[PDB]
C-alpha cells in the first residue's frame, strides 16, 4: 500500500518471495547454460535455504531483513502465537467508547451515568431510524446533519432511544466474570462515566484515574441477555463462594 507522501509501505513477505523467484530463476539459467557442477550445487543449496526462510525463519542463520537490521517475518511467524491466535483468541470492536469514572452516589443499583457526548456517538444509527420514522428528516443524509448541529429535537430522540437499552461496562484487566456487567444508562452532562458505589468493589476500581470501556448490545437477543443474565442486580453473590459481593465497602 502507498503511504501518504510518495513512499510505499510494503509487507516483509515481498522480500522472501522476491528471493525465492530470483534464486529459482537463476537456477534455470544455470542448468540450460551447462555450468560446472561445483556451481549448480551452490545454487541448489542456496535456493532451498531461501525457501526454508520463507516458511519458518529462524531455524537457520536467521536471514536478516534488507535495508534494516531486524529479522524478517516468515509465514510461520504470523500464525505462531503472540500469546493469542491470529483469528479471535483479538477482535477490536465497533460501537464502543471509554472515559474516566467518578462517583455519582445518587444512582440506583441498576443504572450508570453516560455523557451526552458518548450517548450521541455510540447510538448514532439508532437515531437515524427515529428521525425518519418520526418524520422529522426526509432522507438519511438530511438526518446526518441534524445529529451534527445537535438541534433541540435530537436530544428528544436520543433520550427516547436510551429508554430500556442496557450497555455493557467493562474494566481493563477483567479477572473474573463480574468485570463485565450491564447497566441501564441515564444521560448526564460532562465527560466521565459515573458508577454506583456498591458496584466498584466487584470491578476492583478506585476513582483516581481508572478508565472503563462501555460497549453496546445491538440485536434483540443481545439486550434480553444484558438484562436477564448480565444485569447488575442479578449479580449479588460471587461464584467463587456463595457469599455476597455487594458489601457496603
Amino acid at each position: 500500500v502507498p503511504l501518504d507522501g510518495g513512499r510505499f509501505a510494503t509487507s516483509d513477505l515481498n522480500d522472501l518471495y522476491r528471493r525465492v523467484i530470483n534464486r529459482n530463476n537463476r537456477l534455470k539459467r544455470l542448468l540450460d547454460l551447462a555450468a560446472p557442477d561445483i556451481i549448480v550445487r551452490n545454487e541448489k543449496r542456496m535456493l532451498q535455504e531461501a525457501v526454508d526462510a520463507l516458511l519458518d525463519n529462524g531455524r537457520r542463520g536467521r536471514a536478516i531483513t534488507g535495508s534494516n537490521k531486524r529479522p524478517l517475518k516468515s509465514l510461520a511467524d504470523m500464525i505462531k502465537g503472540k500469546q493469542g491466535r491470529f483469528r479471535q483468541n483479538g477482535k477490536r470492536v465497533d460501537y464502543s467508547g471509554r472515559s474516566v469514572i467518578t462517583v455519582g452516589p445518587y444512582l440506583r443499583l441498576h443504572q450508570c451515568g453516560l455523557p451526552k457526548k458518548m450517548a450521541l456517538e455510540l447510538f448514532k444509527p439508532f437515531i437515524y431510524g427515529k428521525l425518519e420514522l418520526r418524520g422529522l428528516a426526509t432522507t438519511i443524509k438530511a438526518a446526518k446533519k441534524m445529529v451534527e448541529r445537535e438541534e433541540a429535537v435530537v436530544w428528544d430522540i436520543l433520550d427516547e432511544v436510551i429508554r430500556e437499552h442496557p450497555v455493557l461496562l467493562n474494566r481493563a484487566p477483567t479477572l473474573h466474570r463480574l468485570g463485565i456487567q450491564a447497566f441501564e444508562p441515564v444521560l448526564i452532562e460532562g465527560k466521565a462515566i459515573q458508577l454506583h458505589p456498591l458496584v466498584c468493589a466487584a470491578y476492583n476500581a478506585d476513582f483516581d484515574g481508572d478508565q472503563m470501556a462501555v460497549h453496546v448490545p445491538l440485536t434483540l437477543e443481545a439486550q434480553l441477555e444484558a438484562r436477564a443474565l448480565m444485569m447488575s442486580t442479578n449479580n449479588i453473590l460471587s461464584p467463587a463462594n456463595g457469599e455476597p459481593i455487594i458489601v457496603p465497602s
Binding site: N42, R45, M46, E49, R60, G61
Partner: peptide
C-alpha cells in the same frame, strides 16, 4: 572436518 556448519558461505568457501 565436517563440523556441523550450517551457513552456506563457509560450506562454499572450503
Amino acid at each position: 572436518e565436517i563440523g556441523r556448519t550450517t551457513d552456506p558461505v563457509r560450506m562454499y568457501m572450503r
